[PDB]
Amino acid sequence: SVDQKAISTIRLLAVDAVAAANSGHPGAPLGLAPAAHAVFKKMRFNPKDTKWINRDRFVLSNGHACALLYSMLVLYGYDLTVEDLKKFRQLGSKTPGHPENTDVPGAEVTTGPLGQGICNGVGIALAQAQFAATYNKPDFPISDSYTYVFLGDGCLMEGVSSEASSLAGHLQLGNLIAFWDDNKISIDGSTEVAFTEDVIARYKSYGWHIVEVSDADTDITAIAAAIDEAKKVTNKPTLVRLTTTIGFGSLAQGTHGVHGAPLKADDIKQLKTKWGFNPEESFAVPAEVTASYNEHVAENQKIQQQWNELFAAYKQKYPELGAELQRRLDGKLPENWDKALPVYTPADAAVATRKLSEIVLSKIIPEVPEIIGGSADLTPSNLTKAKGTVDFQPAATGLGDYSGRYIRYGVREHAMGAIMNGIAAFGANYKNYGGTFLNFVSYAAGAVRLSALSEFPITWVATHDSIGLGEDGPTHQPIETLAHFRATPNISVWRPADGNETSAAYKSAIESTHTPHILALTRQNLPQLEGSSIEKASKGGYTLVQQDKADIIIVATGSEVSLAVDALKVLEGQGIKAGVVSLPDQLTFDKQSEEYKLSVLPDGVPILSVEVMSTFGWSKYSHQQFGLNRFGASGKAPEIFKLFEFTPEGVAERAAKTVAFYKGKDVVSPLRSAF
Amino acid sequence: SVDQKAISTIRLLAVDAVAAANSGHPGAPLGLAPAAHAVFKKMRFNPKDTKWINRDRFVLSNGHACALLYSMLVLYGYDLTVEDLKKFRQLGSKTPGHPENTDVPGAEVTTGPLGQGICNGVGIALAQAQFAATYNKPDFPISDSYTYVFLGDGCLMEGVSSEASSLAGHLQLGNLIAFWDDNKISIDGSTEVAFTEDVIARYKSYGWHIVEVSDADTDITAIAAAIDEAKKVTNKPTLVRLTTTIGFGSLAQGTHGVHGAPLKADDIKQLKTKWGFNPEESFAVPAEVTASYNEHVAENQKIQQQWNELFAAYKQKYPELGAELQRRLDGKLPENWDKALPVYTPADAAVATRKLSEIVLSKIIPEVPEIIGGSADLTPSNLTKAKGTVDFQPAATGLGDYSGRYIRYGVREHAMGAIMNGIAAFGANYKNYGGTFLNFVSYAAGAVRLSALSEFPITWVATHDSIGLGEDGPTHQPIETLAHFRATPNISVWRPADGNETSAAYKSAIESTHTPHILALTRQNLPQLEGSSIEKASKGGYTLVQQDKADIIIVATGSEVSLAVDALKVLEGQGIKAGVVSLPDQLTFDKQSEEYKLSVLPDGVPILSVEVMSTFGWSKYSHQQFGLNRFGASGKAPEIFKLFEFTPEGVAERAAKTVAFYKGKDVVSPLRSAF
Ligand SMILES: CC1=C(CCOP(=O)(O)OP(=O)(O)O)S/C(=C(/O)CO)N1Cc1cnc(C)nc1N
Ligand SMILES: CC1=C(CCOP(=O)(O)OP(=O)(O)O)S/C(=C(/O)CO)N1Cc1cnc(C)nc1N
Ligand SMILES: O=C[C@H](O)[C@H](O)COP(=O)(O)O
Ligand SMILES: O=C[C@H](O)[C@H](O)COP(=O)(O)O
Ligand SMILES: [Ca+2]
Ligand SMILES: [Ca+2]
């Protein structure tokens, strides 16, 4: 049949791509080609408009199987061709060894790190439910799309997927349909060696619906029927168990050796002949397969054309909501939204930056509907919920509604991070955030790094940033955390010192379109600074206190800026004149012009950094670094600062020693380099 | 009864400790005091010998509830007193806000970061099973101890606990008995808001046994009976559901407000009167409670005394095993074990450091029985299994035995990291390791940081360290990872360049008693270096190529040392003389004497670092840094190195620019500082 020919075409494209690279993973593509064929024939999508907001989404969580995804995208006429398949895994190609949303048309998210994609699919589905609840009206199903996810045994072993699956079942996300490649093989061999749990019973315990397809190597009728059944279960995400043979058709089918290495040339020949293909030919695409797939594309394009007319009618019937939706689909924030950001003066009271953050959210959430967010069981500590909003929950629970804006993630940092990436991936200008303590953002490092690589504008509201949290002690007090994320490409790590800087940090986080943000916020109160403003803090680094005859400049962030200002006064009594630089975001600063940066960190003056965490990275901006390179302590926060000499006198002492160390030396800016 | 009085004493000690600190968590201590009383009365332990190797272990995974643990330790006469309880959460005290194994007698592990302790308990139980299988003989139950873990809803939501619970059920760890504080309250309120899964059905799906105690606020008879039942189920770990009221007895019992803040003074008064205590008194310890607890200690001490005689008899009956066991309990490695480490010369072939690691393990595993380890589903890629060893599996599976030495962790990096901490915590000189790709050690950051804070000598075998892995691409290629762990206090991050350095790295990792190690190892082959040795590499940094008239020194690690040596030859043709420093472990280097370090990085010469990852940290050792501060690429590894100019000519060009940049300048060692 043409369906059988399509499945064979998919299998052979994937195997030929691996063969040409002499690298990659043929096994799961061979096992999942029937399911991929069946799912894509049920999906609504436009290869010529990858951003249609009512498309069904597909996520390949077992990202190593990407030769399968690339074959589907090629066959359906996305902006990816057989010539790109021939360049699988080659430097600069559109077919990298794991799918990247920035590089691959039709890749919704970046996968490859196991467990992430299923959680991203939970986030795409969460966003779709929230979006539909916000916009749909009687006779106007603006959003009614599904989220289809393929995943394997590896994803099911990673804890992040358990977190997201428990939450998805709690949230009754009936438009999520996941498919487990139940092939009983991972890299270390049989799953009997390490993965003997009853997966199906576990997913029932989360409140998922189950469909089992016992012969997923051939039974596309049953795979299609499983999708139909899943769509009838509107209050549970569904897991479809696809019992497959890894490497189906290979001489080496059913073995770990087919997971991750190219097939032998003679194996490829026998695959082709058994399926009616020419064993002398590679990258064959039968015209009948193209015709069948083109039929489905043309049908989907007529569906999108009708949706465009529905959207035009919606804008007539619901003028305000229609304009809001149009603005969001254009990627634009509300005009002058930032006038809602709070502004402070030095006469205002001291406030913790966690509380300043709460106040910002309280002002901007009502003004910017595409902001949604939550906390990982730390809502009253991170201060992430605006009073008066409703939680995102299924209405059946009585605890919220899908039109809600606040997500109770539970104690699930890693899944929260990957769900945020899925919410961003949904599109529609979502600007979403997640709260936890800064030290526990580290639990989610797998997802955070993917936010950076995927260029998603997600925001971590990361409170309790330092030893300033006090009594909870060294298990809770960050030391390495800012260095880790600052050393990751494309992460904006804001550590605002006061109210104006906190507003600048949120202006950056909400305006972002390609850079994730971590806002490192305090438990303890900080004074409003003389010289701060949203304008200057928006530069990432700025001169807070200018001193034309400076003997030293102190550069600091967050809670240590006020400390630097107090140290300036101690130094004045020692006959030393200091300037102060505030550096709320190193990434934003680094992106300013060279002349702007040199105006902040000039030649001819020693520069001392002060930040109560690791000194790593700080030599980019300073000659000497005062930091904390040991674990913290359990005690009242002011006593910890005193113990580690983060006091005005301790900073002044190190500043005076820095001035003395450079006497008789020529000093150039830390910004200078040899190359 | 005296039991009722003991429970009240525990509850009131914990509440009074929180009250004195005006900080901490009274709710779970109040709810779990009956269970704590019942479990400690079943446990065998010696407060005067916290290291008795056949003790039962207790782990408080819900570490915020530590006022409960500290109260039990005080009541049983550990080296912790009521005066220490009065200093709960105060700077420098023995009663920090979360338990720390380095500081608290009777704290087996450091908890506080949720999910960790239950996984540590899995590791303690895994080690006990392996230890018992290694040493027990007929009539000689050298090891027969249990592992008891308390955990709450937060731990059950963290994915790391799902990973370890799935693995523990697969491993049939019948001496693990966990207790879930089923109180339906977390920080964000009712568990109905985010945690509605059927926990019991999930744990059945992992192959755990279940006992439910419906009235754990009072029914110590049923808690004791649940322990007895769990001990009869020798092939499954058991979860005991303790249905409790958080803050039991408080006016605010059953609310989130009692989770995490001190009780009101009038609430404490009514608690005391309802339980027969004087509301005017704090930190009361009734003598009858002390007497009852002392009885149990005296019984346990007689059990340990009999075990000591059993051990003496074992040494007579099994002379070789007895001496091995004695050596391990003394904390000593076999005499001259390190003579088994492979040594290489520059005439030997190029080898990837992952393969060199395999070879080391193959030589040292047969010589050092306390080495055990595994991989997170990457055994044939990390090369972590010595040929001929047997896997650690229950014999009932046919796939291994508990006397085995190789652990199939599955795709569970975070749980592997926390399980390794539990294996180390068991004691008996275990030197245990876990393999994954370096980029995915980041999945386990929560546990890795705890290895450092807890001072456990665990080892990550972290292969595929850089863009040198090639085609898998930027989702797999570390950039930030070494900076992150180097910036964490107390982590030895070895990045060996060749065979001799790899042996030095393992000598350090296996000799360690207080510092975790990460070995960053290559996929790709590297040459044996002229000038390397175990002796010099053991210093952490050393002069590989000495040049008395150096115009520049190049400092490098790992794969970039050979690159630096090749660049030296290009520079010689440009009229520039270079020295080379190899820095296989920055922590080890930093611990050398100041004069040794200055002999490696002297004054008077520009120093350029070369490492194909983040430049963070490198200014400690260099004036200029050549690194990779952007994500990688999917392609053949040599082409990626060429793209980023990590070539002999690219290094030489930056070295020449560095020499020119310092012309006419006075240069002092990067090791100098102002303070
Ligand atoms: C262990 C693992 C594989 C087995 C999957 O086993 P599986 O999901 O059952 O797949 P399959 O056998 O049915 O094909 S792939 C993978 C690749 O490096 C190719 O991406 N690694 C390494 C791996 C480890 N940990 C994380 C977080 N992500 C990973 N990517
Ligand atoms: C969310 C969380 C709490 C609720 C537990 O909720 P729970 O386990 O049901 O406890 P309980 O209500 O019955 O007392 S405590 C905790 C403390 O900061 C006191 O350690 N945090 C923050 C927290 C978040 N994430 C990690 C990895 N570790 C944490 N420590
Ligand atoms: O569990 C409680 C944590 O210790 C808590 O959230 C810290 O509370 P805080 O907001 O007072 O810092
Ligand atoms: O899944 C396979 C990963 O891509 C694999 O383990 C890498 O294999 P390697 O050992 O050839 O690098
Ligand atoms: Ca599999
Ligand atoms: Ca609870």
Swiss-Prot record, chains A, B:
Belongs to the transketolase family. Substrate binds at H25, H259, R354, S381, H464, D472, R523. It catalyses: D-sedoheptulose 7-phosphate + D-glyceraldehyde 3-phosphate = aldehydo-D-ribose 5-phosphate + D-xylulose 5-phosphate. It comes from the Eukaryota. GO terms for biological process: pentose-phosphate shunt. Thiamine diphosphate binds at H64, G112, P113, L114, G154, N183, H259, E413, F440. This is Transketolase. NCBIfam families: tktlase_bact. The record marks H25, H259 as: Important for catalytic activity. The lineage of its organism: Eukaryota, Fungi, Dikarya, Ascomycota, Saccharomycotina. Keywords: Calcium, Magnesium, Metal-binding, Thiamine pyrophosphate, Transferase. InterPro entries: THDP-binding, Transketo_C/PFOR_II, Transketolase-like_C_2, Transketolase-like_Pyr-bd, Transketolase_bac-like, Transketolase_BS, Transketolase_CS, Transketolase_fam. The active site is at E413 (proton donor). It is an enzyme of class 2 (transferase). Its EC number is 2.2.1.1. GO terms for molecular function: metal ion binding; transketolase activity. Its cofactor is Mg(2+); Ca(2+); Mn(2+); Co(2+). Pfam families: Transket_pyr, Transketolase_C_1, Transketolase_N. Catalyzes the transfer of a two-carbon ketol group from a ketose donor to an aldose acceptor, via a covalent intermediate with the cofactor thiamine pyrophosphate. Mg(2+) binds at D153, N183, I185. Transmembrane segments: none annotated. Binds 1 Mg(2+) ion per subunit. Can also utilize other divalent metal cations, such as Ca(2+), Mn(2+) and Co(2+). Binds 1 thiamine pyrophosphate per subunit. Homodimer. PROSITE patterns: TRANSKETOLASE_1 (PS00801), TRANSKETOLASE_2 (PS00802). GO terms for cellular component: cytosol; nucleus.
